[PDB]
Design brief:
This is part of a larger assembly, with three copies of chain A. The first copy, chain A, is of the alpha+beta class and 506 residues long. Chain A is built from 14 helices and 17 strands. Helices cover 31% and strands 16% of the residues of chain A. The first copy, chain A, starts with 5 loop residues before the first helix and ends in a 7-residue tail after the last helix. Chain B: The capsid protein self-assembles to form an icosahedral capsid with a T=2 symmetry made of 120 subunits.
Chain lengths: 506, 53, 506
């Protein structure tokens, strides 16, 4: 006997038969060819296409967390930060506690805008040969014309540096981890897996909050919609958005008084610091398992309701943080209605979000910080909003609670399988309607296969038009649990409390 | 899981490999045939014999 | 400046894009597929096949070298070997000089038969995964049923060992390099290139010489045809051929007297030694540039003419080495007519061999031994044989001289491009007729592409039926020369002299 293996007797045969090219670049359409050469007689019955997506952008909206009355966590936080600022600024101050908190929320929307345009500037340096989505797909997902950023690099750099210089002239506490959380989410690129051909997660604000001081009936934060993906917006549009954001704050006396008071209370080492940007500044896609766990359990709440929204049967449901001194004893009030999808109709997919959510985690041992960070983008409906009128085309919902930000949409950027193989923009909620047409089933299947390329992708709740039936969470579960509205509301009420937290005076 | 191929009779259309891909390659028939020949020759080999001691 | 290359900045991209499987096994049909997937509408206009040949067998015939009278080199050699044997065997001998030389030629045909069946036995052990022609194509080219050699291995081994025991009981001088040359050609496998997927050259005797002592009119060596390629001959047929070869020599008194005289003249250390064979015995394909140079300049002379050949207008032209004592003063006589192709018709391709040959060599400096070994299988026609009668269907030729062996045919063994992809046997001369039919042009092109895979393949002389025109040497030339019949005749007359050479007594 010899008892040596065949692969050890001829290792050259094995190493020659298995030399294959791997690491195909993504961002590029690939045609697989035919194994049966005669199968071109079957036109669409043979799928020879292979498109890999690269960008899924989480479209979000910063919130204070469901204010109903003066006992809300943002009003308790307003009380604590005004007690801290007031007993560090001995003198005569004219603003209330809620004017100070609304100044802090407008400061947050400014910092999100600055990190947004800085991400537009810092993405455009990204190149790698093995991912062709860099950097144009990431710029398409942020709503900017990518050629405008390359052609006007110095004007863009001046604009973002002047946004940092202007918006950085107002003080905000860095002891609040609210600003640090939005800076963490809003200027980071996140891979779904620690590989080089990984797929990118991003966070883009759907809307920001514009201050809008009015009359004598307090203040009223109103939405300012950001560019959506596929819009080829240029630098002048972002300049108009910036000037619309700080129109009521630049060179304003009351905002300067509040900024100097926050400067004197929290010292210069205890304020937030905006980041500068040059031609050297670039961000690299990092692996963060805390980001992926809350992208996984994210639930999209729909489009923001504006003044120009024409909700049939739902007047006055526009999203606004209000501070009327004659209403609710002068409490900061924010309770938006969810389930709006931009149009004046029912959107039957939101019925699929009326079941209890699934909280899915990797591993088998879960920390309390891990569990509470994995639930930060989740938002469950609790009741239906009451239709005021005879008929009502849409159906709105009221949650039990939400965190410092709600998800509005997701935007997936892939390549088209038809020539010239340009990028494709697909915007979706967690819920997806498939109406009865032949051009919807294979397209929905393509979208589902595109979504399952993303590792900790949000859980899908599809529904069918002729089946009258929603299917549950389309996601691979590892170690799951069923959450109810009260548990998630407890976690939201904990996290809104922790984000708006300041120390004491001693 | 095995990669799936889904034909929709309403659309006269199939969709390709329904799977999450990590590090992949397109494989043609002759490459797979060469690999099959290598493995079947390896599986039916007897090293107890005097064939290439 | 950095001035580092792109391939040094991303070496992983280059090493991933160029990982391809090489070293495809030969002996196997390969389908290439389509690059235009729609091109199945063009049925035979797209060639997707790729067949590589593995065996080209040179079919030869051992000769003494154009005896016309008693001044021939074989008669001078007979005189010298009979003077050597006679003045070492003091006593009364009854045989002449020519009986001794005809015994030596019959001994050569015996040794070629023994090395032939030993090559049949020693090929059947050959296996490699990267060449699927081993060993069945080499056994098909030798004219044996390959399954008979595997099923009856012990009977085959006994038969070849008894051929060596019987035919090795007759003495022959090993000082004659004639026997050593036929042993070199007839039991060696030769690669066209020093690689592992190389293609094999072989030598198989077309015919052998049977002794046929008759009456009182001397002796007459007559042909004994060997199995051709594609014949699935079994062990009983080779046993019948062996018994037909040694029917007039085993247990014969005159052959024993001549064998004992050669034994006493040339000592036991100076006789030829046949090789034994067991289950351990196998031959490996070696690289010999001397074999390839004479395969390159080889010129096929056609089929041997027999008694049962029906040449119209050419009676008595059968190939036979005769020793009539009343004719040519009792000289050994052999002058065959060439250009016979087995049938009773003209075979117009042999007109293409009526031009001067090209002697092609590698390199730029050529040794005299190199030049004279490169011309050993070449044979040029000189005149036409005179037709005796009114009409004559074939056309025969007379050479100016030939070596110790002439080439009759070549047999190329490749794989079929149609299922079940079994072996294909193609037999050809240097000259090739392409008659006017659609099934001949692409087949001839396939045969030409199969021939140019063999490195030092013989030079082709094609001719066309409708063009009435032969094309010249279809071969790649490196450092060539034009040979005439007188130069090649001088080289043949030198080499026949050197092969039949014995030393002196002192």
């Amino acid at each position: 006997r010899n008892d040596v293996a065949w692969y050890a007797r001829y290792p050259h045969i094995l190493e020659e038969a298995t030399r294959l090219p791997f690491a195909y670049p993504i961002g590029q359409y690939y045609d697989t060819g035919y194994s049966v050469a005669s199968a071109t007689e079957w036109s669409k019955y043979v799928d020879t296409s292979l498109t890999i997506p690269g960008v899924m952008c989480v479209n979000f909206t910063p919130t204070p967390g469901e204010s109903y009355n003066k006992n809300s966590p943002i009003n308790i936080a307003a009380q604590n930060v005004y007690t801290y600022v007031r007993h560090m600024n001995s003198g005569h101050a004219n603003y209330e506690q809620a004017d100070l908190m609304m100044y802090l929320l407008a400061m947050d929307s400014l910092y999100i805008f600055h990190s947004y345009v800085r991400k537009i500037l810092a993405i455009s340096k990204l190149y790698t040969p093995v991912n062709k989505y860099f950097p144009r797909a990431l710029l398409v997902a942020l709503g900017v014309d990518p050629e405008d950023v390359f052609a006007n690099q110095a004007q863009w750099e001046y604009f973002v540096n002047m946004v940092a210089y202007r918006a950085g002239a107002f003080a905000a506490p860095a002891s609040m981890t609210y600003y640090e959380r939005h800076a963490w989410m809003s200027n980071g690129l996140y891979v779904d897996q620690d590989v080089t051909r990984a797929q990118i997660y991003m966070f883009k604000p759907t809307m920001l909050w514009k201050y809008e001081n009015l009359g004598t009936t307090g203040t009223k934060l109103v939405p300012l919609m950001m560019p959506k993906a596929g819009d080829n917006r240029k630098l002048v549009d972002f300049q108009v958005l910036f000037n619309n954001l700080v129109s009521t704050m630049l060179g304003d006396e009351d905002f300067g008084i509040m900024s100097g008071d926050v400067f004197k209370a929290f010292g210069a080492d205890g304020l937030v610091k905006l980041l500068a940007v040059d031609s050297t500044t670039m961000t690299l896609p990092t692996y963060d398992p805390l980001i992926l766990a809350q992208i996984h359990s994210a639930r999209a709440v729909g489009a923001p309701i504006l003044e120009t929204s024409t909700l049939t049967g739902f007047p006055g449901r526009q999203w606004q943080i209000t501070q009327n001194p004659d209403v609710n004893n002068g409490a900061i009030i924010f309770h938006p209605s969810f389930g709006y999808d931009g149009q004046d109709h029912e959107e039957l997919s939101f019925r699929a979000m009326c079941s209890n959510m699934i909280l899915n985690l990797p591993g088998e041992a879960h920390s309390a910080e891990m569990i509470i960070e994995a639930t930060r983008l989740a938002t469950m409906f609790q009741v239906k909003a009451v239709p005021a009128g005879d008929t009502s085309k849409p159906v709105l919902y009221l949650p039990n609670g939400f965190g410092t930000e709600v998800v509005n949409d997701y935007t997936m950027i892939s390549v088209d399988k038809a020539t010239p193989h340009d990028l494709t923009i697909h915007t979706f909620f967690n819920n997806i309607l498939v109406p009865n047409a032949k051009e919807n089933y294979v397209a929905n299947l393509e979208l589902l296969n595109n979504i399952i390329q993303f590792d900790w992708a949000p859980q899908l709740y599809l529904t069918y038009g002729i089946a009258q039936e929603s299917f549950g969470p389309f996601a691979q579960l590892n170690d799951w649990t069923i959450l109810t509205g009260e548990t998630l509301a407890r976690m939201h009420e904990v996290c809104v409390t922790s984000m708006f937290d300041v120390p004491q005076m001693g | 899981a095995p990669q799936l191929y889904l034909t929709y009779g309403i659309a006269q259309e199939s969709f390709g490999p329904f799977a999450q891909l990590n590090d992949w390659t397109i494989l043609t028939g002759e490459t797979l045939a060469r690999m099959h020949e290598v493995c079947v020759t390896s599986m039916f080999d007897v090293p107890q014999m005097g064939f290439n001691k």
